Paper text:
Cryo-EM grids made after mixing apo-FluPolB and hANP32A show a majority of dimers with a 2-fold symmetric interface, which are quite distinct from those of FluPolA. Several different pseudo-symmetric dimer structures were determined at 2.8 to 3.1 Å overall resolution, almost invariably comprising an encapsidase paired with a variable partner. The dimers have a 2-fold symmetrical interface, although the peripheral domains of each monomer can be in quite different conformations. The apo-FluPolB dimer interface involves the PA-arch residues 375-385 of one monomer contacting PA/332-338 and 361-364 of the second monomer, and vice versa. In addition, the tips of the PB1 β-hairpin of each monomer (residues 360-363, closely associated with the PA-arch), interact with each other across the 2-fold axis. The core dimer interface buries only ~2200 Å2 of solvent accessible surface compared to ~3600 Å2 for the FluPolA symmetrical dimer. The apo-FluPolB dimer interface involves hydrophobic (e.g. PA/F335, Y361, W364, I375, M376, V379), polar and salt-bridge interactions (e.g. PA/D382 with Y361 and K338, E378 with K338 and K358). In the apo-FluPolB encapsidase, the PB2 lid domain is disordered (as in FluPolA(E)), but interestingly, is observed in its normal position in the 5’ cRNA hook bound form of the encapsidase, due to subtle displacements of domains.
ANP32 is required for both vRNA to cRNA and cRNA to vRNA replication. ANP32 comprises a folded, N-terminal leucine-rich repeat (LRR) domain followed by a Glu-, Asp-rich intrinsically disordered region known as the low complexity acidic region (LCAR). First, it stabilises the formation of the replication complex, an asymmetric FluPol dimer comprising a replicase, which is part of a parental RNP and synthesises the genome copy and an encapsidase, a newly synthesised apo-FluPol, which binds the 5’ end of the nascent RNA replicate to nucleate formation of a progeny RNP.
Author numbering:
A (entry chain C): 43 to 139, 226 to 741
B (entry chain B): 1 to 187, 202 to 229, 240 to 632, 655 to 668
C (entry chain A): 1 to 61, 72 to 716
Write the structure that this text describes.
């Protein structure tokens, strides 16, 4: 009644797996490199041959290669599930108080106290170019926002971004579509974009009226005073949101008219909510009975208008409840919608659907807007038209491979592609890096590749790691000759300022761990799953992608011992003397008095001896 | 500084702070209420609450039956089994009034499902008593033994396939003058099958017997499962249409039920009035509910049904009103000076003077003597031993919650029922009338046989309560106990085990309210257990073994290492979003063509719920 | 199958039939033949009813039809319509759910579809139903059976037979005629008869006041019970009442005050292994996994002085212990581990039989001899002692929540995060493991789990002999070094049985640096020898060996192995705290709770008292305290602790209601307190929990006034 223990014991047995009889069953060798894969035993009556799990390993490694055509056809449902998952778009996760394609993701969509917004995808492959362009622009904006002087970083990254094979600038200039992020990037690169006011997902084009912002202290439903710039006077705009459009006529803290056309229910709801929030109706302000402290990915506090926008997008019922209701006229063209966007005469107060098609404002209006430091676009008149706050937060995977040839984007790796890129960058610039290093100049540590590398070093230990690496490099340079492999391995860690202990010496380490451990570590004195080197074949295997290291090596850095650059302040001396004691822990090594001797174990079979300087 | 854990409550609500106080939902290894002493205690307690009612002798079995129903009303606040039939009937009539056609629809649906059910269905349950061997056997084993022994007696109903003929044979076997069966005897020993015979009365006692469990403390035989199935189906059909019923619910819709109940009660409060909620506990729920009341409930529910279905439904409460409790292994008497021990079985409990039992057991036996049959079994006519009629008991509770008023007073009550757990809500004008309503509900419950716990139930203004271990406070919801994943692997095969583990984590975060971080940690722990059990650590690791030696070579040879399965030393790519996709399907696109061909070889010699892709890892073990 | 059903039946019919089937069947998609039958039945019903019409007085042409369709709709509504029609037309309501209602003759109608032949299915339906309702039987082959002449005419008949012929031809030519099932099989079983034994048992299962089951049946079926509840409530005694009382702070008194009685003994340590007093002998390695015997061998080689100590210096002795037996067992374990054999078998099995006390087992005899022997009596139950608070539980809580230099947790990886919820979970896990990686409780939990795993692994065929199970662990420090830690050796006894609950004796000898005489009342269950001295950082520490004869079983071994779920328990509790915090806002508050944002400062908790004043700490300290509390709850778990934790929840919720100003009311507060207090006898965790609850309740009382 304990299957787990039974199976654990069975796997520890010799031949626990039943084996069939046939040509393929007889292709398994009796034993591989001393491992008995199949039993050479004949059962008395059953004639049942057995094998070891090592037999399955051998079959998967060297066994005959069968044909794998039509495999996707048989298991089509599972591949459809994977396709739906991969093509899906992820929104935002909200805390506090169904199609079969959604029940699959129920575990990742609905929680007891949280809810995840999820838009399923699949076979939306026609417009891959525009989708990839918008994904790239959104990622660039997100990266640049968290940086001081976002405009400079955004323009620098956007020039080094390639979608499939065409530069992002070419895609932006050609496609002409996109979203707020695409427009921001275009105006950052000096291109031209269509002229529309932006409030979240709402595109506005004034067609009559005037407004003047007045600073005021308004009270909200939750009972707090907020400083808002209110719009006074009667204004009329053409409003659009996704596939829905309409006309909004508003006045001071009041929505007069909101004519719209039938469209997607979610899109219509978003349009109506954004129109209510933009109207600045006091009826909207009074409906805020929660807490509005939403921040942005930069960590800063959203402005009050966007605070209310986010709140009411999350909690739409709180507004429709405190929005009142009325009865629409029986005109054939005119209609009305309830809180659920249905056909009901009991419609919202000030909102009305219509049958006649409303002409879109999206005429060709290519213009050259001005972009400020914080990714805000302003007309020649000085009025801000869009900003970073209006960029959609939806996330999806690009249908075309996008490559950002810049270290600033390396942070979007998996902590293994980041290491791969960083170490390949060191190897490519190894000659120049070493030439600069052998001059007493240390600005090399400030390069952007090491900036990206520091993003995976534990913040607690980053200073100590950097101090140890810098001390080891200085020892390898000044007082002794250099070892190229250790120089490459320990250079990236040098970015952070040293965090030397009170003793005036660096923290000694046996391994340097990175984010997402288990196998993400660098051995200071031995090969690692993320960085290994062959001292004789001159091969630098980074994550199993062996790269040659011919020429950059030196003849004098081969006879030298690996133990000269394994601990800061310790230089190899003597040999493996079994008189001082066992292989001392690092703890003894830091505590050792200067000039003393110690024993070390570089790896399995290479003892050495060192002396503190 | 002295660390006080309880000070966490000074900064966090107690509902959030006591989340998952128990990491399990099963019985611990130490809190085991099993033994002859516990069974005798249950019998004495059950008859204690009904000793003011009728008592007579059974004309069929000869046991001493006690009937509390329609007995005198209680005069104190002790547990009472003296439910009044008229009050139960009025509650059920009002429940039918509030839901027109619900009783009829439930009866018809249960009847149709019964007409479609097959004898094979009495094999999905837990251990069952076996009269042939007088021992607990798995449902399939007991069913097969009963079918064979019935064929021995010329009762062939299981062959027809339908469950109704099998139940007909079950109840007709009660009229046989004497029943012959196959008994397994350790005749060195060996389990040899012999043709044994018993008389009608002994067989009747065996069919009404409920053995004690050792690994619910009582188990029933196969004679009653067929009828309990239909009775519980009828009860569930009634329960799923009641807004108060909350037992069938599970997952994120349980929180929805709690929130909807709270909001509905708050909205209907009188302007300027007060709404209170009582977190309720029931005392001796199992020991104070009578099978006679359940017979009356089934009779009222199936009023308009055809008589055959009415009788079929009445059979189960009939068989549980005449039940016999087997008292277990017996006691153990030891001589300290002689260093000797011996187990006195149940038939020989009174074969020695009671002065040789400790005080508590001596008193227990003194009280048990009247109801002690001279075979090691006691008579337990009143009470519902353990969970056997959970749906029907929930129906009775919800019927109690449907009265809503007494004497047309200034209060209205509603609530949630989950069998013996419940929450009450009372709307009135002030706390005084609210407590008046709570008192009236307590008295009505007493009249119905339900005993609210005063020592465990309490009250406070609506907006915070607990239901079925789920704490609700201002919308936020927490759980007191959660069955966190056990440790190990399912043990089927390395291909299936990954699917089973990932499905377990997925269902835990769907139903049991597991969080993202907890689920990711569970994934990590399961992968650790998987790699430990199947010796399939990563190919780039430094681990020695027979299979790991070849896994390392496979790692070195393969180029698309991210496509290798975990069983092949490949990386683990499971996260929250992709717990429903087989790992072969996940890694197909990244698999090397040669490795994919070898693994997906239709002619490999190894192959010979959860979703898995057949391959060299879907092997078999003898 | 689904393709044909979609093609030959309109969407409305298919959905209605699917609903009708799903009402009674929990696996509707596993039996499409039934679906075929119901959709055909609905087609026939519509054909009968859709066309035939009527008018006001008698015209069989307005919009009044002559057929009312009760089928195809939810049964709840169907039963209401059936009862309403029967009552309105003064006719009886059939006990079944009819298919149609004929308005010309005012009769319920049942229509049947027969594969074999009509006039045979007709009589079966007559037997099932009888004179309750008329019948219309139409067969696949041209045939019909009607019980009335004024019923369906020839045109509707021709339409329905044409439909049946089309379906039959399609089934025949698409090889699905084998799947068809006659309606008879759905009705299988209506002849259910009660025997003589079951009838007599039924007659004597009726409540008081009924002679036989027929009287009860008639009484329930005919008597209107209106007014029974109020009738019985008016004549019920006033003494039956909840007796509610408005709870106040003054009602909440300290629980289990007897724990403050200084005349009682203080609780002794009774956990399986030493938690905070543990001392592990450390030996660095390269991370390579080793056999437990080899790990112990190398660790004992590194410490030869302790291993070679052959004479005992007894420091403390348990009252009933035999220091000679224990020391000889310890020496046997050391010799067995140090030997070159690949087995962990003890050499002196016969001596170990009596050293562990396994030979002192009572001899089972025949029940007859025992019955005759008047000196054999049942033993009185062991009443758990009543003990007072001991400072060692508070010290254990203080020490186990601190950070150490070693971490025993190394968990595998998971796929990359792509969804925001996954990023939330990853961030939460990052903070949790950062705060918990080097907690002492983590290493203690891993030691417990590994020890119980070793105990269970050695029960395959080694339950009939004496083994030595090293108490081992593997840890890693911040510098990346890996150590094997040996905390002692345990000899695992032998149970001749294999019942999964038979007691197996484990004699544990654990290293420690704690003088047992400093806290005398903590160690009455242990016999302690001073086995040597150790140097750690130039400081000499005495090394004692705590020896104890404990017992366990396979279930307890599995439970101790499961003890690793305290990690998931703490993760879930932290998640619940963070989710409660983020419900007030609309976004995840993990970073704000842990590190603090620009708007939200880092969250702080009250972690204890220093000299009677509240002391605050970060969320990491609170996390460590939560983990330690979970670990101690698991280690000290028993019936008393389970009862205490299940019962004090109600008091805590009452206190929460008092704090929230929800105006709690209680019916039996003294009953609550007695139920809580009956569990405070000798469990150290329960007694310390009562102490902590009393202290925190005093603090809450004081803070309520302000
Ligand atoms: Mg319950
Ligand atoms: Mg409750
Ligand atoms: Mg029908």
């Amino acid at each position: 009644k304990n299957p787990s223990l039974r199976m654990k014991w069975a796997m520890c047995s010799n031949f626990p797996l039943a084996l069939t009889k046939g040509d393929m069953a007889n292709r398994i060798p009796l034993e591989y490199k001393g491992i008995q894969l199949k039993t050479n035993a004949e059962d008395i009556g059953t004639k049942g041959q057995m094998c070891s799990i090592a037999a399955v390993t051998w079959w998967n490694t060297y066994g005959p290669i069968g044909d794998t055509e039509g495999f996707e056809r048989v298991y089509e449902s599972f591949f459809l599930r994977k396709m739906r998952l991969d093509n899906a778009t992820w929104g935002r996760i909200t805390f506090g108080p169904t199609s079969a394609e959604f029940i699959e993701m129920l575990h990742c969509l609905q929680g007891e106290n949280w809810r995840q917004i999820y838009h399923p995808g699949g076979n939306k492959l026609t417009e891959s170019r525009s989708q990839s362009m918008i994904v790239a622009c959104r990622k660039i904006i997100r990266r640049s926002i968290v940086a001081s002087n976002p405009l400079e970083l955004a323009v620098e990254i956007a020039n080094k971004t390639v979608i499939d094979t065409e530069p992002l600038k070419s895609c932006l200039a050609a496609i002409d579509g996109g979203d707020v992020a695409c427009d921001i990037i275009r105006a950052a690169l000096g291109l031209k974009i269509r002229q529309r006011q932006r409030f979240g997902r709402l595109e506005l084009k004034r067609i009559s009226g005037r407004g003047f912002k007045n600073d005021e202290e308004i009270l909200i439903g939750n009972g707090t005073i907020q400083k808002i710039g209110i719009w006074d006077g009667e204004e009329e705009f053409h409003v659009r949101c996704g596939e829905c459009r309409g006309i909004l006529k508003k006045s001071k803290m009041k929505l007069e008219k909101l004519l719209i056309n039938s469209a997607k229910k979610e899109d219509m709801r978003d349009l109506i909510i954004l129109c209510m929030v933009f109207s600045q109706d006091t009826r909207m302000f009074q409906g805020v009975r929660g807490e509005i402290n939403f921040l942005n990915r930069a960590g800063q506090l959203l402005s009050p208008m966007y605070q209310l926008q986010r709140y009411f997008l999350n909690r739409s019922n709180d507004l429709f409840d405190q929005w009142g209701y009325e009865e629409s006229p029986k005109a054939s063209e005119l209609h009305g919608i309830n809180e659920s966007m249905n056909a009901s005469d009991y419609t919202l107060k000030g909102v009305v659907v219509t049958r006649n098609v409303i002409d879109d404002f999206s005429s060709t209006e290519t213009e050259k807007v001005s972009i400020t430091k914080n990714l805000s676009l302003i007309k020649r008149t000085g009025e801000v038209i869009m900003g970073a706050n209006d960029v959609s937060e939806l996330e999806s995977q690009a249908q075309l491979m996008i490559t950002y040839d810049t270290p600033k984007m390396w942070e979007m790796g998996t902590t293994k592609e980041l290491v791969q890129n960083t170490y390949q960058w060191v190897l490519k610039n190894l000659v120049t890096l070493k030439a600069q290093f052998l001059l007493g100049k240390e600005d090399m540590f400030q390069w952007d590749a090491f900036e990206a590398f520091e993003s995976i070093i534990p913040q607690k230990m980053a200073g100590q790691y950097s101090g140890f690496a810098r001390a080891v490099l200085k020892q390898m340079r000044d007082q002794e000759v250099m070892k190229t492999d250790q120089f490459i391995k320990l250079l990236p860690f040098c970015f952070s300022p040293p965090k030397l202990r009170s003793n005036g010496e660096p923290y000694q380490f046996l391994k340097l761990v990175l984010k997402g451990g288990g196998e993400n570590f660098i051995e200071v004195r031995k090969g690692s799953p993320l960085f290994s080197y062959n001292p004789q074949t001159e091969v630098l295997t980074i994550c199993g992608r062996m790269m040659s290291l011919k020429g950059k090596i030196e003849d004098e850095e081969r006879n030298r011992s690996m133990g000269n650059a394994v601990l800061a302040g310790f230089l190899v001396s003597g040999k493996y003397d079994p008189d001082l004691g066992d292989f001392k822990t690092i703890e003894e090594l830091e505590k050792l008095k200067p000039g003393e001797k110690a024993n070390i174990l570089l790896y399995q079979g290479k003892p050495v001896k060192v002396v503190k300087r | 500084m002295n660390i006080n854990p309880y000070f966490l409550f000074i900064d966090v609500p107690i509902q959030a702070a006591i989340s998952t106080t128990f990491p399990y939902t099963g019985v611990p290894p130490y809190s085991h209420g099993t033994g002859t002493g516990y069974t005798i205690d249950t019998v004495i307690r059950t008859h204690e609450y009904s000793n003011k009612g009728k008592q007579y002798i059974s004309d069929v079995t000869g046991c001493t039956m006690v009937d509390p129903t329609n007995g005198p009303l209680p005069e104190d606040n002790e547990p009472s089994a003296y439910a009044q039939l008229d009050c139960v009937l009025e509650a059920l009539d009002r429940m039918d009034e509030e839901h027109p056609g619900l009783f009829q629809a439930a009866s018809q649906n249960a009847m149709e499902t019964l007409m479609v059910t097959t004898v094979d269905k009495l094999t999905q349950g837990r251990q069952t008593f076996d009269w042939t061997v007088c021992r607990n056997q798995p449902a399939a084993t007991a069913l097969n033994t009963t079918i064979t022994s019935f064929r021995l007696n010329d009762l062939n109903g299981a062959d027809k396939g339908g469950l109704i003929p099998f139940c007909q044979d079950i109840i007709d076997s009660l009229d046989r003058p004497e029943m012959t069966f196959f008994s397994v005897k350790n005749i060195k020993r060996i389990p040899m099958k012999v043709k044994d015979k018993i008389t009608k009365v002994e067989y009747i006692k065996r069919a009404l017997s409920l053995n004690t469990m050792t690994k619910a403390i009582a188990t029933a035989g196969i004679q009653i499962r067929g009828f309990v199935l239909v009775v519980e189906n009828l009860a569930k059909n009634i329960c799923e249409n009641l807004e108060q019923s909350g037992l069938p619910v599970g997952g994120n819709e349980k929180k929805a039920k709690l929130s909807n109940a709270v909001a509905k009660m708050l909205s209907n409060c009188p302007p300027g009035g007060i709404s209170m909620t009582v977190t309720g506990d029931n005392t001796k729920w199992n020991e104070c509910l009578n099978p006679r009341i359940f017979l009356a409930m089934t009779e009222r529910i199936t009023r308009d049904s055809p008589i055959w279905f009415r009788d079929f439904c009445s059979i189960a409460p009939v068989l549980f009103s005449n039940k016999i409790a087997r008292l277990g292994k017996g006691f153990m008497i030891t001589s300290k000076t002689k260093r000797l021990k011996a187990q006195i079985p149940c038939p020989d409990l009174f074969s020695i003077p009671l002065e040789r039992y400790n005080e508590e057991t001596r008193a227990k036996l003194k009280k048990l003597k009247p109801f002690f049959n001279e075979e090691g079994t006691a008579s337990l006519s009143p009470g519902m031993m353990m969970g056997m009629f959970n749906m029907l008991s929930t129906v009775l509770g919800v019927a109690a919650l449907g009265i809503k008023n007494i004497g047309n007073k200034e209060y209205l009550w509603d609530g949630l029922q989950s069998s013996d757990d419940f929450a009450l809500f009372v709307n009135a004008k002030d706390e005084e009338t609210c407590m008046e309503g709570i008192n009236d509900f307590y008295r009505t419950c007493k009249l119905l046989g339900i005993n609210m716990s005063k020592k465990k139930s309490y009250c406070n203004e609506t907006g915070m309560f607990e239901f079925t271990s789920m704490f609700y406070r201002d919308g936020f919801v927490s759980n007191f106990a959660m069955e966190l994943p056990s440790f190990g692997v399912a043990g089927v095969n390395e291909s299936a085990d990954m699917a089973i583990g990932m499905t377990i984590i997925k269902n835990n975060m769907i139903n049991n309210g597991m969080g993202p971080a907890t689920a990711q940690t569970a994934i990590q722990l399961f992968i650790a257990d998987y790699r430990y059990t199947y010796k399939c650590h990563r190919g780039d690791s430094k681990v020695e073994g027979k299979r790991m030696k070849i896994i390392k070579e496979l790692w070195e040879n393969t180029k698309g290492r991210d496509g290798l399965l975990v069983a092949d030393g490949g990386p683990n790519i499971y996260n929250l979003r992709n717990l429903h996709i087989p790992e072969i399907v996940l890694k197909y696109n990244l698999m090397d063509p040669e490795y994919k061909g070898r693994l997906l070889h239709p002619q490999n010699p190894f192959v010979g719920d959860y979703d898995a892709v057949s391959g060299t890892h879907s092997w078999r073990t003898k | 199958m689904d393709t044909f059903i979609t093609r030959n039946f309109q969407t409305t019919i298919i959905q209605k039939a699917k609903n009708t089937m799903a009402e009674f069947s929990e696996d509707p998609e596993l039996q499409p033949a039934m679906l075929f039958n119901i959709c055909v039945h609905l087609e026939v019903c519509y054909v009968i009813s859709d066309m035939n019409f009527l008018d006001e007085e008698g015209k069989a042409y307005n919009l009044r039809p002559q057929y009312e369709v009760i089928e195809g709709m939810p049964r709840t509504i169907a039963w209401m319509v059936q009862r309403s029609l029967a009552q309105e037309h003064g006719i009886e309501t059939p006990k079944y759910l009819a298919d149609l209602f004929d308005y010309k003759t005012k009769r319920f109608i049942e229509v049947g579809i027969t594969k074999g032949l009509a006039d045979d299915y007709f009589w079966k339906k007559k037997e099932k139903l009888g004179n309750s309702m008329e019948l219309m039987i139409f067969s696949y082959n041209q045939d019909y059976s009607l019980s009335n002449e004024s019923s369906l005419d020839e045109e509707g008949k021709g339409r329905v037979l044409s439909r049946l012929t089309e379906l039959q031809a399609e089934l025949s030519l698409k090889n699905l005629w084998q799947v068809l099932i006659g309606e008879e099989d759905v009705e299988k079983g209506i002849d259910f008869k009660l025997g003589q034994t079951i009838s007599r048992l039924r007659d004597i299962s009726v409540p008081a006041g009924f002679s036989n089951f027929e009287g009860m049946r008639s009484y329930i079926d005919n008597i209107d019970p209106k007014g029974a509840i109020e009738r019985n409530l008016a004549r019920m005694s006033p003494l039956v009442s909840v007796t509610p009382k408005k709870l106040t702070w003054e009602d909440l008194r300290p629980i289990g005050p007897h724990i403050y009685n200084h005349e009682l003994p203080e609780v002794p340590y009774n956990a399986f292994l030493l938690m905070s007093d543990e001392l592990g002998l450390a030996n660095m390695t390269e991370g390579k996994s080793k056999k437990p015997k080899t790990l112990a061998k190398e660790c004992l080689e590194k410490y030869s002085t302790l291993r070679d100590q052959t004479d005992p210096i007894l420091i403390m002795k348990s009252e009933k212990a035999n220091e000679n037996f224990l020391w000889k067992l310890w020496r046997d374990c050391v010799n067995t581990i140090s030997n070159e054999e690949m087995s962990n078998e003890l050499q002196k099995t016969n001596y170990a039989k009596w050293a562990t006390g396994d030979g002192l087992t009572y001899q089972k005899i025949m029940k007859e001899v025992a019955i005759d022997d008047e000196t054999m009596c049942q033993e009185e139950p062991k009443i758990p002692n009543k003990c007072r608070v001991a400072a060692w539980v508070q010290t254990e809580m203080n020490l186990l929540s601190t950070l150490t230099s070693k971490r025993a947790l190394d968990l595998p990886e998971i796929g990359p995060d792509v969804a925001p919820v996954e990023h939330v979970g990853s961030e939460r896990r990052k903070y949790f493991v950062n705060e918990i990686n080097y907690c002492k409780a983590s290493t203690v939990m891993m030691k417990y789990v590994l020890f119980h795993t070793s105990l269970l692994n050695e029960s395959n065929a080694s339950m009939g002999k004496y083994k030595v199970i090293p108490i081992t662990n593997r840890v890693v420090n911040e510098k990346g070094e890996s150590f094997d830690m040996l905390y002692g050796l345990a000899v695992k006894g032998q149970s001749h049985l294999r019942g999964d609950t038979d007691v197996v004796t484990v004699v544990t000898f654990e290293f420690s640096s704690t003088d047992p005489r400093v806290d005398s009342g903590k160690w009455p269950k242990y016999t302690v020898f001073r086995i040597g001295s150790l140097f750690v950082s130039g400081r000499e520490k005495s090394v004692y060996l705590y020896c104890r004869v404990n017992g366990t079983n396979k279930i307890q071994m599995k439970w101790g192995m499961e003890a690793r779920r305290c990690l998931l328990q703490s993760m879930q509790q932290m998640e619940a705290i963070v989710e409660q915090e983020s419900s007030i806002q609309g976004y995840d508050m993990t970073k704000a709770c842990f590190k603090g944002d620009r708007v939200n400062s880092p969250k702080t908790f009250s972690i204890g008292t220093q000299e009677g004043k509240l002391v605050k700490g970060s969320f990491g300290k609170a996390l460590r305290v939560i983990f330690t509390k979970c670990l101690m709850h698991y280690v000290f778990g028993n019936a008393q602790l389970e009862g205490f934790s299940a019962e004090s929840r109600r008091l805590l919720l009452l206190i929460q209601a008092l704090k929230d100003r929800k105006g709690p009311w209680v019916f039996d507060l003294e009953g609550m307190y007695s139920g809580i207090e009956e569990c405070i006898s000798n469990n150290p965790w329960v007694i310390q929990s009562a102490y902590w609850f009393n202290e925190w309740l005093g603090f809450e009382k004081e803070g309520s006034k302000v």
